[PDB]
Amino acid sequence: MRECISIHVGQAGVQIGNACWELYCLEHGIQPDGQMPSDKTIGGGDDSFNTFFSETGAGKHVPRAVFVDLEPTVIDEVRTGTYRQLFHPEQLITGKEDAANNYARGHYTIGKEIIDLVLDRIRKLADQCTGLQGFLVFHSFGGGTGSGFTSLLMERLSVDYGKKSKLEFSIYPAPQVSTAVVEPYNSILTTHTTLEHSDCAFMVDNEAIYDICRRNLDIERPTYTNLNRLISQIVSSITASLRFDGALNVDLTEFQTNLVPYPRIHFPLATYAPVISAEKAYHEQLSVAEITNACFEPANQMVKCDPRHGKYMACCLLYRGDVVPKDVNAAIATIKTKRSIQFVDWCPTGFKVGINYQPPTVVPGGDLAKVQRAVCMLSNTTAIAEAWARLDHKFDLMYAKRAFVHWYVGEGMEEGEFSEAREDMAALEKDYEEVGVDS
Amino acid sequence: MREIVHIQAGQCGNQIGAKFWEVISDEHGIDPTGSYHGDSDLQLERINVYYNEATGNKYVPRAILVDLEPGTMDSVRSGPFGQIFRPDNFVFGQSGAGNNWAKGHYTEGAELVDSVLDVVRKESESCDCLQGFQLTHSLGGGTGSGMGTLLISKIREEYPDRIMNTFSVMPSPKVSDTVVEPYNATLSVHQLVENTDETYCIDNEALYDICFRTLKLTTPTYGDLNHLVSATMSGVTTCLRFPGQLNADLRKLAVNMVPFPRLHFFMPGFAPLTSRQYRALTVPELTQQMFDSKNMMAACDPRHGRYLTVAAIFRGRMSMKEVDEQMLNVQNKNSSYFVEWIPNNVKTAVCDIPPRGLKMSATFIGNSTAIQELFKRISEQFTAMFRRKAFLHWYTGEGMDEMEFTEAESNMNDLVSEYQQYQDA
Amino acid sequence: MYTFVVRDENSSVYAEVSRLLLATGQWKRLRKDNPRFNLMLGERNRLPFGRLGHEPGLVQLVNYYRGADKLCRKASLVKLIKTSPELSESCTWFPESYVIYPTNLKTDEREVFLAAYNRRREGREGNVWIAKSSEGILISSEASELLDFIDEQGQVHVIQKYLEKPLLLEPGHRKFDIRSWVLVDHLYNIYLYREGVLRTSSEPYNSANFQDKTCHLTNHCIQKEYSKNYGRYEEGNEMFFEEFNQYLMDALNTTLENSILLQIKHIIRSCLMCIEPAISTKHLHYQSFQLFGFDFMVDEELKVWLIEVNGAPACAQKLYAELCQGIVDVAISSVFPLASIFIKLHHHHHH
Amino acid sequence: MEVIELNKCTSGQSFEVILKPPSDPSLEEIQKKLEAAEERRKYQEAELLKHLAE
Ligand SMILES: Nc1nc2c(ncn2[C@@H]2O[C@H](COP(=O)(O)OP(=O)(O)OP(=O)(O)O)[C@@H](O)[C@H]2O)c(=O)[nH]1
Ligand SMILES: Nc1ncnc2c1ncn2[C@@H]1O[C@H](COP(=O)(O)OP(=O)(O)CP(=O)(O)O)[C@@H](O)[C@H]1O
Ligand SMILES: O=C(Nc1cccc(Nc2cc(Nc3cccc(C(F)(F)F)c3)ncn2)c1)C1CC1
Ligand SMILES: Nc1nc2c(ncn2[C@@H]2O[C@H](COP(=O)(O)OP(=O)(O)O)[C@@H](O)[C@H]2O)c(=O)[nH]1
Ligand SMILES: [Ca+2]
Ligand SMILES: [Ca+2]
Ligand SMILES: [Ca+2]
Ligand SMILES: [Mg+2]
Ligand SMILES: [Mg+2]
């Protein structure tokens, strides 16, 4: 067994990590005080779930997690909430004043004075690991902490753990749920500084999640609680192979091998089905065919875009529940004759399939219905570059007038870091269009 | 980012500041003696932002009251909530400032300013996490204008990294004590342009017109004018004073509202416009009135400019779905008036606790290029006297040179140019 | 009040659609780059489909189908017909055609082109071909000139069977091509406009001199200049449907619907049904319509041939009024309701 | 449609179906950048206090 450390940065990263660790506990039957009645090796072990939990002599199962925020109120809600006993005080790190939606404030000014305490609390966890593989990093593109401190952290982690793998779960900015006009700036800055330090990055557009919540959960105006419980179901799908016995994606290196041939194009699109309101009076359960087919509707993606108009480089299907290979292969053969799925020429047209027989777990009292089978598709398609174009356009509208730049320069940043980051993004967009478009 | 320090300077500054502490002490359940008395415990989750808590769990405003003569502060100490204020925080001289910016900034005010800063330093030192300052003052007199801007310069020296916000009453010939108000205002704006993060521009002209044409008051007093200012000040600060999803602080507003450091003069608005009726307002009605120029407090036509940013704060229990539809409707119907080069520059917030006497209300904070009309007016009134050097002897007799007037007028005309650049961009 | 933007100023059709939208008094034109639009009359090249449908509170519609260029580019069309099972190599209404890259570029079909070209050397059949790119037209029964002329150019060409025995109108013994206008709305209703036009040659066809390219190239521009009998028989080399029907009635004893149109509706419906899964915007976050120009030729046995699909067609002068009103009717007001000239193409044969 | 590397266990199975074949800066260099931005902050702050001193 090889351990994984989860790093949650800033408000979005902390609230999403809360949602995920709650889900993990339900799935592995770990109670809020950290007791796991079914773990019969008291005080130790190296089962699959120990990738994410350590054990104490008292039989307490402790997340391999560190929560970091430049301001205390969100992590204070962790310290006083339902899972207060779950975490050790030293794993919950807060500053005093936050980065004020300012990348440079979180990176240069306030980051510089807390980065060393964080790396030391992170080494405290690495030290209880027999063979650490690396890191799951949760953060928003748009917050000053989530962008600026996360990029500082990523650079330093490459320095202090240069062999380990680094995976990101990133919240892409959506105006419907954001109170900041500078999120495009922060997004570009942090993507530029983090790109080479990340092996695999799963982007979640708050706008897609918001509309899935309205459309399929009948929630009129979703809150962060609604968004996060859905996002955590998806994250759970993606990490179940690290936490459960199986043979697909069993360590972090395999996510890069299976999903990322070209290391800069490391942004798989996630699609999830079915999402069913728990208040839905009467529901006919969806078959393997119907949920697999739903994996190819844009309305079920984590990022609205159109994979019909790009090319695929890899595809993983991750099923939970009552599924067997014959149903999957029949569903694929049907879908292939009815949909525009084009792969890049130097890749096999094919699917890696993982089936875990336990159906998805839902938070009691949440919005999501229990279902008999569900699926998460991870596809590396060039169509996700659409989300970069959107973001880059917004950045270009503001930066042409230098709107808000002075807030960044006043933190130590140089104006030229803006156009550096922007030109890296332009390289990125051209990479995508080379791999995915014919003349 | 938690405690805020409030300063009120001169006559207008203290009359409006007193009304502000009345209004928000009513919202937070605090009574004129400092004792809490409400129902919701959310009257006190963020009570520390504006109140220091003393022994007996008694709440004392983090308020410094400044004046160069004792008249208005003896009125405040006799006023409704006059006992609320920490008596050590009344700092006053005896001589007055004679509606003379030079006496407030350079002579009388200079004598007094260090003792004011001593009270500020003591209020800051007892703060876990001071986030910045607000100042209430007019720009047309001498104390609030001249000493008020002297204070701001001193506070920036000693706290260069805290947020500085002003609530600044603009002089108007229609509501006017003296002919030198355009001189005082121009000298003051030159200070405000450099040393504040946010300036809420309240035109006495606009308050007068609202009271007359909308509240149907034929003879508006300063008391009726200040009722509208304290209602707007309440709405503008409600997000900082009550728990909600936003977790509002000073800096994020400053960061997101101010795309260029000198263009930080905001147009405030309030809806529904009331005068101390029982009709329920709909969310579509709130949203239309909030954006109405007749509900705005700086006498500028938003249709003559372009919005750089917009904060809309709704108060009370209403549909978020309907608020977001109505908000999205005004932008998508009048999109030419929002600059296209700041994507998504209209942000909205909701506080579930409504103000006293209303079930639903909205506050508008606009960074519009039409605020240039305010500075043009002042500049025309200024130049009309300055080209004949009229009334200058009141200032040169305090040490000032004509050159200092010519520089302040040039800076204000520069700020008018800056605004006109982005109205055409 | 709906809002729209225009980003192609060289578009007669959508210039007229723009004016018609304004004159309703319920549509407002915004600036070319204001994102807060309901409708985008977009550019022909590099239209930014990936920025559509992300404006909260705005249903967005555009007048182009992302991906329809696979129909509106000669090489794309050939690839699409030869590789789509539902069109297939055994496609009876498309001329035999091969994709040819220049030698400076070296995939390519010159291999298989000569294999069939020999069976017309061997088989004594008429081995004339035409070469064209997506000016630059060569008709010749010698493949050696075709492939030489293509390498002399820089871009991909297609070598296509030249239809040597076309139906020629009398009086004239002269060529023509038919242009149909087809509107595809956001629901993927396929609407053929009831008025077509015959782009006619005013020179007697002559099968001996394939280099005199004025009785062989019925293009309205090549006939406006290089042709000496422009305007003789009809005004501007344009015959409309009422006449062509009457001529067919009088000359051949048949009608336009039976002898030609059934085949045209079959071809239009087949092409648009083929690419429907690739381009439909049924469950997408923005919506598309698009106007196409379909170009047909009729041989002497009254067999219709598809020549080319045009994704940005101009309309015919006298028809602009009726067509652009019809676009607004079924493509725009269908989506944005204010306060038939088309035949709907649909067919459900059970088997 | 080839099914390959099928693995089975108590908790599930995994496999691969093929439809078609194929047709960093150092701790020092980071510390420098974080210090070259702090010096730019200290400069800007000094220029402000110099201006306030005039
Ligand atoms: N899905 C989701 N998005 C969130 C959540 N919280 C914040 N966001 C998004 O993240 C962006 C704002 O960033 P934050 O994470 O709150 O900022 P931060 O990282 O804490 O950094 P500061 O600027 O210092 O406060 C916006 O796009 C928000 O909508 C959350 O709990 N769930
Ligand atoms: N296989 C073929 N056989 C006989 N004639 C052909 C032919 N292909 C094209 N033509 C003739 O050339 C003309 C069509 O040329 P082409 O298909 O390249 O259109 P174009 O793109 O140059 C202008 P537009 O796009 O508006 O129609 C027709 O008028 C037709 O007479
Ligand atoms: O500052 C004062 N009032 C005040 C009012 C509202 C919010 C905040 N504070 C914030 C704002 C923010 N983003 C934000 C950006 C633009 C608009 C909006 C809004 F308001 F429209 F929702 C929110 N994020 C965190 N805190 C402060 C008075 C001067 C003392
Ligand atoms: N809105 C409002 N304006 C006032 C009030 N008192 C004075 N003013 C205006 O403020 C200016 C005079 O400034 P004032 O505060 O009296 O002088 P100071 O005591 O030296 O600061 C003039 O433009 C007056 O119209 C008041 O109570 N409310
Ligand atoms: Ca164990
Ligand atoms: Ca690395
Ligand atoms: Ca004295
Ligand atoms: Mg935060
Ligand atoms: Mg006075």
Ligand SMILES: [Mg+2]
């Ligand atoms: Mg002293």
